[PDB]
Design a protein around this ligand. Sequence first.
Ligand SMILES: *[C@@H](c1c(-c2ccc(Cl)cc2)c2c(N)ncnc2n1CCOC)[C@H](C#N)C(=O)NC(C)C
Length: 258
Amino acid sequence: DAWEIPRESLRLEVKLGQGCFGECWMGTWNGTTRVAIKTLKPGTMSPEAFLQEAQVMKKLRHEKLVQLYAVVSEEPIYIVTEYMSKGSLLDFLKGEMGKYLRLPQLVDMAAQIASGMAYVERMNYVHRDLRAANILVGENLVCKVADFGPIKWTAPEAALYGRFTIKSDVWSFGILLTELTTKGRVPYPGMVNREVLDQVERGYRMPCPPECPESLHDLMCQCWRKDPEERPTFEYLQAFLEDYFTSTEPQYQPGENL
Ligand SMILES: *[C@@H](c1c(-c2ccc(Cl)cc2)c2c(N)ncnc2n1CCOC)[C@H](C#N)C(=O)NC(C)C
């Protein structure tokens, strides 16, 4: 295992995250290079359980998935990755940084996540938890996919029958598109989880968010088709979002919030 590294090489400066699973920090690796590090509390999560997501980050490599750098596979376990300067995509949209984002940047972000997911698609994996809080933003508004181990984001066939496919990811990607256009507000405003399952199942889909182009709401609606197989591919979505402003919405004018 060439991914393995020694311990004195990690300085853990700033503390970013925590919970049941363990902490995650900003650090340094061999004195110079800036990294992000994620830790394990041995009590709650088991040793072979926490490893799970790191075996998965070894077998994947793409400019839009957060990159593995090194691992310390002896307790307490450490996982080392590139440092995404600008935090979770959800915080970014909610906070004072995201009030000035308009459609052109928001669509470019969507296209980058779509790229990363089209790579997941090609490699026959399934994400399961694709949403704005597990997208990390970097310098120059680079967005990358982050979690490798919630009914408002999960497709119904998945939430009800455990059927998690790349098509169930496409559903979630559609909800992610509403997070990008409402500055990271919670999808299904006012509805609690049990009420969302009922409504969705009976055909309800979110309306076109204010100032969102109808062509982009149509796309969300393709991603939310009752039938998994009539939802588009990430290859299709990528290509669509990449060319948005020539091929679909060349008329685009900026507005007050998009
Ligand atoms: C904390 C975290 C990470 C991160 C993600 C994945 C891995 Cl394997 C290691 C660390 C971040 C990175 N890479 N860059 C910048 N910020 C990062 N954070 C976000 C800080 O959240 C406040 C990680 C995430 N996301 C986390 O908190 N996860 C546990 C399971 C709660």
